[PDB]
Amino acid sequence: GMQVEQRTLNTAAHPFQITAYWLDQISDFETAVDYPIMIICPGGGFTYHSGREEAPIATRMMAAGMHTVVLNYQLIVGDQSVYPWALQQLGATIDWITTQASAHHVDCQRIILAGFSAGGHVVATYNGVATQPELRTRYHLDHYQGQHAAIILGYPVIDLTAGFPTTSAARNQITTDARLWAAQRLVTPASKPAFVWQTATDESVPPINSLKYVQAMLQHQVATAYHLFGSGIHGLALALNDQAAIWPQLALRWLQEQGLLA
Amino acid sequence: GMQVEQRTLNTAAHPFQITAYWLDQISDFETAVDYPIMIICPGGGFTYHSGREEAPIATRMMAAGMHTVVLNYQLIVGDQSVYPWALQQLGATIDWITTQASAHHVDCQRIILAGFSAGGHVVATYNGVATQPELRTRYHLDHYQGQHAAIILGYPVIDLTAGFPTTSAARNQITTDARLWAAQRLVTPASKPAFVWQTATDESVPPINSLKYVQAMLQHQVATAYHLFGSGDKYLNDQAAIWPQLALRWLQEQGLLA
Numbered sequence A: 001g002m003q004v005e006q007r008t009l010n011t012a013a014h015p016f017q018i019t020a021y022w023l024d025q026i027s028d029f030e031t032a033v034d035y036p037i038m039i040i041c042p043g044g045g046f047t048y049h050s051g052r053e054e055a056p057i058a059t060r061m062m063a064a065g066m067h068t069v070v071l072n073y074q075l076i077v078g079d080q081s082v083y084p085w086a087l088q089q090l091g092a093t094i095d096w097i098t099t100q101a102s103a104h105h106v107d108c109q110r111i112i113l114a115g116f117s118a119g120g121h122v123v124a125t126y127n128g129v130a131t132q133p134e135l136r137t138r139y140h141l142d143h144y145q146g147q148h149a150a151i152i153l154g155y156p157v158i159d160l161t162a163g164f165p166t167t168s169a170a171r172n173q174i175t176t177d178a179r180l181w182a183a184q185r186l187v188t189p190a191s192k193p194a195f196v197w198q199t200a201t202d203e204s205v206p207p208i209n210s211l212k213y214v215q216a217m218l219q220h221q222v223a224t225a226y227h228l229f230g231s232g233i234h235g236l237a238l239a240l241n242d243q244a245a246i247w248p249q250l251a252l253r254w255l256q257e258q259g260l261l262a
Numbered sequence B: 001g002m003q004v005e006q007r008t009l010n011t012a013a014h015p016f017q018i019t020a021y022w023l024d025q026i027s028d029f030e031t032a033v034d035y036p037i038m039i040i041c042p043g044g045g046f047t048y049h050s051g052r053e054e055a056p057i058a059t060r061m062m063a064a065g066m067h068t069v070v071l072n073y074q075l076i077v078g079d080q081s082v083y084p085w086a087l088q089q090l091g092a093t094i095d096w097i098t099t100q101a102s103a104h105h106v107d108c109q110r111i112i113l114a115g116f117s118a119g120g121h122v123v124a125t126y127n128g129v130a131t132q133p134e135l136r137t138r139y140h141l142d143h144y145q146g147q148h149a150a151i152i153l154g155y156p157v158i159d160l161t162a163g164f165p166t167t168s169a170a171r172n173q174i175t176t177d178a179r180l181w182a183a184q185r186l187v188t189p190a191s192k193p194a195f196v197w198q199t200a201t202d203e204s205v206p207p208i209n210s211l212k213y214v215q216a217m218l219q220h221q222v223a224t225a226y227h228l229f230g231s232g233d234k235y236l237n238d239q240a241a242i243w244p245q246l247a248l249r250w251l252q253e254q255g256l257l258a
């Protein structure tokens, strides 16, 4: 069982919506077991918030014994830019989770960020910025509590010059802050570990994006797994076990290896 | 059941050893089967031929229904170069397999090359050279019959300037033919499909080697997959059990197996 909580949060005068899915305890009368938590930054190419792939992933991750929160980060809608706002909102969401840690029994040493497509850009960029003191200051992230332990990236947008979006006017709408264009360029040995996956045949998000982030992580010897699946079927929305999608099985095992999951 | 055959073969005045592991036919009421075959180019940094990881891998793969041959390609031993000799030996080994195909029931439309570390350089370079008639001529492969359908690469050496060897004298010893240094640069749409992987327990070069090959394959629209579990034991044991499942699935997706 789970409790669903919808909220509208606000930071930096850019309100945003989240849904929390709080996993129930085995008993209300037992000493609490603090569960890890995954914060999901959806896809949607910075114009919408994808749910199609994200909802099944949330379900699967929870069945493994985790809480999940979906973060509907700033979009370009209504002639806005995404940054720096999305980074502040992700920071504010992590902070909010910490404030809920006793109420819903959240292990705040085991906060995992997961980003898909455009959300992958937000997460990957966060992973860089939030782990460098100078950049936290610059993007005002030192106002927030809590930190992530690791990230998961599925078909992430990583470099806004690498094919998505298709035009420079679109890139500059997302942000004119060129420092945030290329998330791989913000990787340092301080970046938290990452599990990255994509399909080789991806015609929506150019695969060069994940190759770029993985290169940089490996260059700085950050703990990293990367799975580029041969067939597009492995990237389809969810419904080794031959009867279930491969990638969640790999990600879960990786989280176990990283000490982030029982 | 299998039969083991040891041979010392010779091409280009550079002898080389192979061992072939020929899967037995079963007497049954299933239709005749010619089995695929995997040719293993071992690791060993061009100074030895590794068996420690290769042996159980050969064993796992044969259990999926394939023959295997192990090719002890040219090393730098005795003040020698690796190339072009290793490519010619691999070509010769494939030719040899075609001549043995009726005797052992080998599906020569399903020859799979598997290269580990330094042997990954041989296999990756071969996938590029042997699929281009002009480079076939240049490296005297025009002479040999048979062609591989796909390759597997474990933790491969791909670009002899991307970390290993650590010295120019070393690189030159492997080969002074700089066209052969960077296998990714020889990828074309004619290159065969490639499955690449590495587990955390694997000791090899920086994985940017693998990434560079895989990107080249993507750029030329050749089927490829890449499974990096980590770069550097219940969990490590498990990775060893998991990657072959992915390899075998991929081989099935490619029509190369069951």
Ligand SMILES: [Cl-]
Binding pocket: A049, A050, A051, A052
């Ligand atoms: Cl959607």
